[PDB]
Amino acid sequence: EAAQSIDQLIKARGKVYFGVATDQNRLTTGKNAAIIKADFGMVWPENSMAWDATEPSQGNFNFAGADYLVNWAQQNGKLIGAGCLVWHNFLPSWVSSITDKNTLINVMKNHITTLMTRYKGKIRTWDVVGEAFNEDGSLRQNVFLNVIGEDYIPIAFQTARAADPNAKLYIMDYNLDSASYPKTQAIVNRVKQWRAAGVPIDGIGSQMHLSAGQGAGVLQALPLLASAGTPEVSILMLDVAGASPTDYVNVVNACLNVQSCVGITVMGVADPDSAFASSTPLLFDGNFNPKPAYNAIVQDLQQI
Numbered sequence: 496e497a498a499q500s501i502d503q504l505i506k507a508r509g510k511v512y513f514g515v516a517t518d519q520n521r522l523t524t525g526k527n528a529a530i531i532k533a534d535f536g537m538v539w540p541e542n543s544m545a546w547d548a549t550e551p552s553q554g555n556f557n558f559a560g561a562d563y564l565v566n567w568a569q570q571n572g573k574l575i576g577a578g579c580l581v582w583h584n585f586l587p588s589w590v591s592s593i594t595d596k597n598t599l600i601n602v603m604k605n606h607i608t609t610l611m612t613r614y615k616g617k618i619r620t621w622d623v624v625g626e627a628f629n630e631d632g633s634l635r636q637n638v639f640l641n642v643i644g645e646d647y648i649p650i651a652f653q654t655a656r657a658a659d660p661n662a663k664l665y666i667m668d669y670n671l672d673s674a675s676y677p678k679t680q681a682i683v684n685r686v687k688q689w690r691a692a693g694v695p696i697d698g699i700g701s702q703m704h705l706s707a708g709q710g711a712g713v714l715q716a717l718p719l720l721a722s723a724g725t726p727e728v729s730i731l732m733l734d735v736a737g738a739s740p741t742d743y744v745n746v747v748n749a750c751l752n753v754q755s756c757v758g759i760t761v762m763g764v765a766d767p768d769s770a771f772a773s774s775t776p777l778l779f780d781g782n783f784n785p786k787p788a789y790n791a792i793v794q795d796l797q798q799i
């Protein structure tokens with residue numbers, strides 16, 4: 496049927512992409528590769544770029560999984576996003592146990608530089624820092640904050656910019672879906688401050704793991720995120736419990752409404768492959784058929 500690719504359609508509305516998280520296992524099973532080829536314009540590593548996947552012991556990197564994704568995307572004419580370079584998730588014990596500031600700075604910089612160098616010029620977007628905020632808006636006391644202090648964030652970004660000046664560098668977080676929530680306000684205020692200091696934060700990414708009914712709030716939250724003045728914002732990790740068309744369409748329209756929002760990435764293709772499968776929160780069902788939300792996004796994006 497005509498005009499059924501949400502990536503094609505969103506590009507026709509002036510956005511950069513509709514993306515999806517994937518990896519080698521997905522691409523070689525199910526109908527994921529077919530759907531991604533037809534319907535999506537950008538891919539991200541669901542897991543293969545995580546620190547645990549990529550640097551399981553100090554200085555010793557594992558690239559096979561990430562290489563597969565990058566190669567597949569290149570072969571299929573897809574943009575690539577990657578991350579997360581610095582966050583509290585998926586950290587090897589060898590990182591978490593470091594207590595010396597200069598050591599951890601250099602570990603972090605080597606992790607950033609190594610990964611970004613390997614894929615230099617190939618990656619549109621890097622999520623450099625993730626999940627840096629507490630729910631109250633204070634900085635999360637992860638190993639980086641505890642050992643390095645708050646400079647870890649400027650250092651990460653500056654390191655990333657040096658490693659691959661072509662990439663757009665993002666900070667990302669979750670629970671940025673309500674404009675009145677302290678975390679949402681805080682990331683804006685801190686990103687403004689960091690950018691005023693010359694930190695090269697090109698984007699804020701909103702990890703939109705949503706419960707039912709939360710789409711509507713994003714119409715206010717996304718404009719708020721864009722007010723930090725980054726050149727870009729994006730929607731990441733999108734899924735919605737229940738997959739209501741109302742929620743999905745509100746999210747998409749938030750993207751359309753926000754000039755600086757470049758695109759939307761969904762957390763996966765088909766429901767059974769979600770970490771939240773019982774909430775059937777994705778755009779394709781367990782037989783790989785598009786769900787009502789997919790079709791509602793198509794109608795919303797269709798336009799002489």
Ligand SMILES: O=[N+]([O-])c1ccc2nn[nH]c2c1
Pocket residue numbers: 515516539540541542577578579580622730731732733760761762763
């Ligand atoms: O948007 N994404 O779905 C997504 C998935 C994994 C990631 N790791 N870093 N950034 C990511 C974005």
